[PDB]
Amino acid sequence: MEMEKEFEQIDKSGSWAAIYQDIRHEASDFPSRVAKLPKNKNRNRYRDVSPFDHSRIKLHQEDNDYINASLIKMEEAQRSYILTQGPLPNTVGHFWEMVWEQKSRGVVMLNRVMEKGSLKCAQYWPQKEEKEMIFEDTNLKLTLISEDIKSYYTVRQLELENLTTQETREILHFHYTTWPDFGVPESPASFLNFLFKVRESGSLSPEHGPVVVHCSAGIGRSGTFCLADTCLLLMDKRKDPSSVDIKKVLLEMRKFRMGLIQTADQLRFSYLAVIEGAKFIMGD
């Protein structure tokens, strides 16, 4: 079925939970043996969220190459994304090592450091120009260059230096600051505006390594971001845009990382975002 009318049919019939459970039943199951080794327990935020072995990002290190991060490679859309958890106190150095080694231009953050009175990720970037961060375990230096605070999101320019080679690179930090503590946003308008700002920066484009996207576990809000982006790109590429099946796209992405889209409310919100976004692209 098309999307917008499949949407009203699920709303009127109140069957979002049943659609979402079908997705959970059909989703791929692949091994995650490296994630579960004892030496990696303090490298995982949640015991039930792990990267598959076949798609995990490897650090270029001979001691321990493990990080909780996955490469989602979308062949028809010609887009790649790295989805990862919010860094932990003992993985902030690994996180920036990955950004460096994978040649990423942008980092997309969809959570606040504290939510619901608890810490959802480490304070992994500097908050003042004159107070830079040094990660001694991976030999990197990170400096805040500039910051632009808007009503729904903040964009930062960061400089990452590889202290071994003295090479430097500019990284863009796109921080969506207004996702509510409970539930999903009422309108997708600010999320779409945010997606378009990431796109306009070049961070999603083939002349760079894959964008790095995270929330707390790296599967819920993070899944909503890449699912919406990929669905809108396919609608631009194909002769028949109404052929894009958001459930099929989601199952394809779940071949590369488990658990993408965590609730039926996130599934409904993803539909809404693609539907509204397809009107603004045009023709408009």
Q: Is 240 annotated as a binding residue?
A: no
CB atoms within 10 A of CB 268: 18
Q: Could you confirm whether 215 is annotated as catalytic?
A: yes
- In our burial notation (b when 16+ CB lie closer than 10 A, e otherwise), range 134-160 reads ebeebebbbbbeeeeeeeebebbebeb
The pairing of strands 106-109 and 114-115 is unpaired
Residues 6+ apart with CB under 8 A from 181: 115, 116
Which method resolved this structure? X-ray
Q: What is the CATH number of domain 1-284?
A: 3.90.190.10
CA-based Rg of the chain, rounded to a whole angstrom? 19
Q: Is 10 annotated as a binding residue?
A: no
Q: Is 82 annotated as a binding residue?
A: no
Q: Is 219 annotated as a binding residue?
A: yes
Residue in 121, 215, 226, 231 annotated catalytic: 215
What residue ranges do the domains of the chain occupy?
A: 1-284
> Could you tell me which residues are beta bridge partners of residue 66?
58
Q: Is 217 annotated as a binding residue?
A: yes
218 burial type by CB count under 10 A (0-12 exposed, 13-18 middle, 19+ buried):
buried
Token couple for 61:
């290190």
Could you identify the residue written with the tokens 């990267």? Answer: 51
Q: Is 104 annotated as a binding residue?
A: no
281 burial type by CB count under 10 A (0-12 exposed, 13-18 middle, 19+ buried):
middle
